[PDB]
């Protein structure tokens, strides 16, 4: 049951791979539009919605889990991409 939770949450673990700078740099090399940047910020806010959606806290048999730790991890991981987006926005302004 833990692993079922974990499988539902691999999509959220995607943060760990996406946190690499190379992914955001490939997407930035794509030269996306302002609407695209806004779409990534919005998908990011939706990620945050899922981060607060840590409702499952069922005691796994006779074991109680610490979900707030996971939530905090996800939130920090998250914040990474927003700071990345601000820093690339500034250099777009620079070049153009």
Helix coverage percent of residues? Answer: over 70%
What letter string, H or E per element, gives the SSE order?
A: HHHHH
Structural class: mainly alpha
Give the radius of gyration.
16 Å
For the sheet with most strands, the description reads: none
- Could you tell me the number of beta strands? 0
Distance between the termini: 52 Å
Strand content: under 5%
Q: Estimate the global geometry from the Cα principal axes.
A: elongated
User: What is the tally of helical segments?
Assistant: 5
Layout of SSEs?
Layout: H1 2-8, H2 10-18, H3 21-29, H4 34-52, H5 67-95
Notes on the protein architecture:
By secondary structure, the chain is mainly alpha-helical. It contains five helices and no strands. Helix 4 (34-52) packs antiparallel against helix 5 (67-95). It is elongated, with a radius of gyration of 16 Å. The N and C termini lie far apart (52 Å).
Give the structure's gist in a few sentences.
The protein has 96 residues and is mainly alpha-helical.
Characteristics of this structure?
mainly alpha; motor protein; elongated; about 100 residues; part of a larger assembly; 1 chains; 5 helices
